């Protein structure tokens, strides 16, 4: 497998500027940044992406400078998206794994829309054991209780709302705080009640410290949410926990 000469050339020019800002022009720095950004994205951020091809670029980046490795792995497009954002979004976990193995990932870095790579896992279905273990490693590198800039939602709230049981189980295995509240005052359990995800409500209520009396901004508890949403089955589970 050959490396992209346009990418490598643009990385060599970046290596100089990163180490010594008076050793590259700003006209020159501009065109190199843009090329690295374009090429690095195309290399790892498509839904096609070979993990080994990614790996062999990272070693070559690391053999140029540790600071260059950092800068490239965490370079963001106009949407604030990095290779980790896209690879998590595309559920390409072997590429995710190779990125995490770099040692320089930023798993909490929020994009422009306000979401980090940990939060983007809420749309992945975990099929293989290596996908579970990559997601768990991803979770343990960052703050799983972090709140998105839009509405203050957690990774857990997002995963509950899309009904991703495997992502909820992974989150709760890393001791995610079930009682975090978003800007409306909503908990993950309240999300479970609105969407009628019975099993997921069961998984949250299995957490002993889960606080069912928390109220949102309008004074609704999870039981109130459930009852208003016509979720008899979920509302019943709450009654059991109340008795």
């Amino acid at each position: 497998m050959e490396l992209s000469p346009d990418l490598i050339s643009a990385c060599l020019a970046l290596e100089k500027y990163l180490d010594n800002p008076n050793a590259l022009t700003e006209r020159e720095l501009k065109v190199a940044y843009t090329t690295v950004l374009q090429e690095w994205l195309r290399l790892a951020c498509r839904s096609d992406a070979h993990p080994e091809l990614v790996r062999r670029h990272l070693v070559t980046f690391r053999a140029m400078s540790a600071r260059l490795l950092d800068y490239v792995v965490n370079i963001a497009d106009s949407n604030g998206n990095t290779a980790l954002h896209y690879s998590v979004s595309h559920a390409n976990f072997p590429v995710v794994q190779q990125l995490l193995d770099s040692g320089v990932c930023k798993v909490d870095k929020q994009n422009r829309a306000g979401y980090s790579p940990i939060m983007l896992t809420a749309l992945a279905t975990l099929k293989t054991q290596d996908d579970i273990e990559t997601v768990l490693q991803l979770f343990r590198l960052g703050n799983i209780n972090a709140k998105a800039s839009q509405a203050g939602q957690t990774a857990l709230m997002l995963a509950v709302s899309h009904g991703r049981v495997d992502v909820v189980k992974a989150l709760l295995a890393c001791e995610a705080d079930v009682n975090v509240q978003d800007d409306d005052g909503s908990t993950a359990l309240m999300c479970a009640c609105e969407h009628g995800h019975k099993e997921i409500a069961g998984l949250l209520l299995a957490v002993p410290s889960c606080d069912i009396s928390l109220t949102d901004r309008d004074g609704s508890t999870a039981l109130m949410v459930a009852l208003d949403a016509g979720q008899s089955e979920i509302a019943s589970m709450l009654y059991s926990r109340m008795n």
């Binding site: 954002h85 829309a113 749309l123 709302s161 978003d182 800007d183 969407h195």
Partner: peptide, 15 residues
């Protein structure tokens, strides 16, 4: 309320 929203792939990636 955000707890009733069902967010898409595109909404989480692009503002």
């Amino acid at each position: 309320k955000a707890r009733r929203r069902t967010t898409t792939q595109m909404e989480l990636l692009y503002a």
